[PDB]
Amino acid sequence: RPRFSFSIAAREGKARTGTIEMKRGVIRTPAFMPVGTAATVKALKPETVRATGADIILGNTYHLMLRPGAERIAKLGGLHSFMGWDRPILTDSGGYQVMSLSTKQSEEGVTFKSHLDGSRHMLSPERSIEIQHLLGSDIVMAFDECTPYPATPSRAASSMERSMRWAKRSRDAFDSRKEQAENAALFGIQQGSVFENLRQQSADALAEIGFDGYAVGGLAVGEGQDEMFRVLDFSVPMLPDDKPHYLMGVGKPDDIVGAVERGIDMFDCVNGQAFTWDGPINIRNARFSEDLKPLDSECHCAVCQKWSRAYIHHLIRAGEILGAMLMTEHNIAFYQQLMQKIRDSISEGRFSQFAQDFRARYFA
Amino acid sequence: RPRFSFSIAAREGKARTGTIEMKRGVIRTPAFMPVGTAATVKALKPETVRATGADIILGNTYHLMLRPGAERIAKLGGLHSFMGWDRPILTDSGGYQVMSLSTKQSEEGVTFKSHLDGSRHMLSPERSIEIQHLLGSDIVMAFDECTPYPATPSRAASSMERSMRWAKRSRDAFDSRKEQAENAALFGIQQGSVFENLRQQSADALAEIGFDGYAVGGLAVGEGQDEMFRVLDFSVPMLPDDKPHYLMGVGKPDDIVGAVERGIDMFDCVNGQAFTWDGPINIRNARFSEDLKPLDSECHCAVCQKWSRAYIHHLIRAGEILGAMLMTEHNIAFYQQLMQKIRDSISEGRFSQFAQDFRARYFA
Ligand SMILES: Nc1ccc2nc(N)nc(O)c2c1
Numbered sequence: 050r051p052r053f054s055f056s057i058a059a060r061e062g063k064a065r066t067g068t069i070e071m072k073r074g075v076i077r078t079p080a081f082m083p084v085g086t087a088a089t090v091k092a093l094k095p096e097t098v099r100a101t102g103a104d105i106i107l108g109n110t111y112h113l114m115l116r117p118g119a120e121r122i123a124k125l126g127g128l129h130s131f132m133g134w135d136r137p138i139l140t141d142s143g144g145y146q147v148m149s150l151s152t153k154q155s156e157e158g159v160t161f162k163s164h165l166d167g168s169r170h171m172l173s174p175e176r177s178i179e180i181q182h183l184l185g186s187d188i189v190m191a192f193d194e195c196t197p198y199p200a201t202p203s204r205a206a207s208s209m210e211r212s213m214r215w216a217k218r219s220r221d222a223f224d225s226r227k228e229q230a231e232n233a234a235l236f237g238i239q240q241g242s243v244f245e246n247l248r249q250q251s252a253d254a255l256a257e258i259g260f261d262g263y264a265v266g267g268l269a270v271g272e273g274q275d276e277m278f279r280v281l282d283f284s285v286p287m288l289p290d291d292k293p294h295y296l297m298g299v300g301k302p303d304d305i306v307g308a309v310e311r312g313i314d315m316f317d318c319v320n321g322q323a324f325t326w327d328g329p330i331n332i333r334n335a336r337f338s339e340d341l342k343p344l345d346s347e348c349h350c351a352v353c354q355k356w357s358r359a360y361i362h363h364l365i366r367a368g369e370i371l372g373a374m375l376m377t378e379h380n381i382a383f384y385q386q387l388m389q390k391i392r393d394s395i396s397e398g399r400f401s402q403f404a405q406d407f408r409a410r411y412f413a
Numbered sequence: 414r415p416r417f418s419f420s421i422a423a424r425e426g427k428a429r430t431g432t433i434e435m436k437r438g439v440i441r442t443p444a445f446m447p448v449g450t451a452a453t454v455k456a457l458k459p460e461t462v463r464a465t466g467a468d469i470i471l472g473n474t475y476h477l478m479l480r481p482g483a484e485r486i487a488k489l490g491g492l493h494s495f496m497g498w499d500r501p502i503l504t505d506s507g508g509y510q511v512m513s514l515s516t517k518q519s520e521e522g523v524t525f526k527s528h529l530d531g532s533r534h535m536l537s538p539e540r541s542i543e544i545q546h547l548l549g550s551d552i553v554m555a556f557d558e559c560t561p562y563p564a565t566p567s568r569a570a571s572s573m574e575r576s577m578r579w580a581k582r583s584r585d586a587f588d589s590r591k592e593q594a595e596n597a598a599l600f601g602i603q604q605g606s607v608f609e610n611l612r613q614q615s616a617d618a619l620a621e622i623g624f625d626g627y628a629v630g631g632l633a634v635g636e637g638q639d640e641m642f643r644v645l646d647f648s649v650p651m652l653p654d655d656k657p658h659y660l661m662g663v664g665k666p667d668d669i670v671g672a673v674e675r676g677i678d679m680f681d682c683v684n685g686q687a688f689t690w691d692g693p694i695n696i697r698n699a700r701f702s703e704d705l706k707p708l709d710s711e712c713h714c715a716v717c718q719k720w721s722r723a724y725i726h727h728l729i730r731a732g733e734i735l736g737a738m739l740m741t742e743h744n745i746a747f748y749q750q751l752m753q754k755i756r757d758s759i760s761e762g763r764f765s766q767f768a769q770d771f772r773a774r775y776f777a
């Protein structure tokens with residue numbers, strides 16, 4: 050396969066369906082990427098993650114740089130070999146988590162203390178790109194400065210401007226490393242909060258630099274679905290049409306459906322909540338103690354073929370690890386089934402109808 | 414298959430190897446039974462438990478009667494259907510756990526408060542047998558009164574005597590329930606602490622009543638391996654030779670090898686400790702942070718084929734659920750491989766040699 054090749058096979062309105070070909074495998078879009086925090090998708094073996102239908106997973110520069118360490122993972126042979134996942138891996142730049150879990154900020158980057166050992170680290174565009182290389186990331190995310198919501202026009206502009214400067218530094222760092230530039234891909238991140246003029250400026254700067262994909266950052270940070278959808282309405286069209294559009298940190302089923310309707314191709318997002326086509330349910334609720342039905346009536350995942358709500362209800366309330374294993378496999382499988390239905394409906398020119406039917410039942 | 418049929422295929426000294434045929438499947442002996450606490454073998458899907466080589470698992474009357482409840486499990490279709498394990502299941506009587514986790518004792522039974530909700534329960538030989546029936550247990554354990562170590566001759570005798578009276582009540586309760594007597598098996602439990610005359614009295618009383626199997630209870634309660642082996646030396650020969658001998662709660666690898674050398678056919682027993690043919694290791698130790706080798710050099714389990722000590726080291730220190738999943742699958746697989754080597758060596762008349770080689774390396 051090539052280093053990177055995004056091809057759109059079908060369209061309906063702003064929605065698109067296709068594939069991203071990379072050296073380690075093919076990614077079907079729209080795609081949902083399970084998230085791996087500490088070099089593991091919570092409670093699932095990689096083979097199980099693959100079994101649910103995932104084509105790619107997400108890794109975090111922040112968590113990994115702290116534990117077990119980027120240099121260590123490199124010495125060990127890379128993240129893929131380390132955790133046992135041989136398909137594509139997209140790694141975030143770390144910036145987002147540093148401002149949420151660990152901080153001295155400057156134009157050079159960010160310095161902070163680990164929320165684990167209390168040690169210090171100076172994350173910068175250059176160091177972020179290097180760490181993702183050490184991990185062996187397939188899709189590298191530019192290092193940016195997220196803008197907290199709400200944000201004043203002035204502050205949103207300053208952060209967007211810095212991010213574009215950092216985007217240029219990320220691009221140059223990536224291209225200067227021969228092995229990384231020839232085998233991996235680099236995605237730029239659009240910022241600008243909820244302001245259209247800033248989003249336009251960010252998109253233009255990003256397209257001028259040139260990236261393999263474009264992510265819409267700064268959303269899903271407390272603005273609500275209505276506002277998010279409004280921002281996506283004018284933001285996504287600003288990005289290059291022939292490259293993937295990645296909405297960072299968005300995962301609620303209805304959010305995904307609405308985002309795909311607005312041009313998004315990639316998603317990622319991180320208990321007793323189980324998704325069903327009839328809306329989510331909390332398995333801990335007493336009404337499920339003797340319910341012999343599976344989590345969802347049509348879901349084809351292994352959990353729904355073998356265990357009842359009553360059993361999983363018992364496991365979760367008992368704090369048993371198998372409870373988490375089963376709930377997680379079903380939920381990730383549900384998400385993949387959702388992406389499959391989306392891809393098929395777009396391919397058959399009936400996505401709008403699918404969106405309508407989905408919402409009618411999901412919120413009924 | 415028949416309700417119950419134990420056949421010995423080979424022998425060497427006091428060691429035996431053979432099979433126990435039951436309606437739900439065949440059990441190869443010597444056998445190791447993984448333990449299921451709350452209707453689940455910690456962090457493993459039943460298929461994974463089976464994959465490691467287990468022919469039967471153990472369930473607990475105490476934990477299940479508290480959560481989710483015996484009556485509830487029955488209404489739900491039985492423990493097998495509930496947890497998804499269709500092979501044989503041996504259930505303990507609950508008495509042991511009540512005196513360790515939850516108490517008013519009498520000749521009629523024991524009353525106690527749950528260490529969960531604080532509710533009350535009156536476990537008796539009759540209620541214990543009934544609960545195991547409600548669960549759908551294949552091998553039912555008689556309800557006894559364990560003797561704390563150390564125990565005075567007087568107290569050991571009183572408890573042994575009560576246990577034999579309770580053993581008779583267990584037998585009658587079992588036989589009176591048509592469905593249970595025709596489809597399940599009942600094991601009696603020998604008591605008597607470390608005293609030979611009491612063990613002999615217990616064995617005689619048990620054989621007089623008649624059981625499908627005989628367990629050696631009251632050991633592995635703080636007496637040490639030397640003392641335990643000394644008690645087994647004269648205790649096991651007292652039991653009927655043509656029925657299975659079950660050593661309750663004994664699981665350290667060296668303990669199992671020594672017990673089989675003394676006539677035991679069945680075992681069961683309940684972190685970063687990983688077993689290896691070179692002795693156990695604690696994966697949390699810093700010396701494993703960059704060790705690319707598998708947990709054990711020859712173990713054929715899935716964990717050892719796919720992940721390194723370095724990765725599992727990371728997972729466990731990070732508190733990740735996959736860490737527990739992988740460590741548990743390997744350990745249970747190790748135990749099953751140990752039982753297989755024991756069965757094969759006995760069948761080939763070279764068990765004594767195997768025991769010698771095992772110890773030499775395990776403790777080297
Ligand atoms: N809602 C999100 C989630 C993750 C993000 N990661 C980066 N690097 N930047 C953003 O703006 C994000 C927004």
Ligand SMILES: Nc1ccc2nc(N)nc(O)c2c1
Pocket residue numbers: 505506507508509554557559560602629630631632633634661662663
């Ligand atoms: N070491 C053990 C473990 C479990 C036991 N269970 C019962 N019912 N009775 C004993 O004596 C036990 C001893």
Ligand SMILES: [Zn+2]
Pocket residue numbers: 344345348349350351352353379380382383
């Ligand atoms: Zn499911």
Ligand SMILES: [Zn+2]
Pocket residue numbers: 708709712713714715716717743744746747
């Ligand atoms: Zn292993």
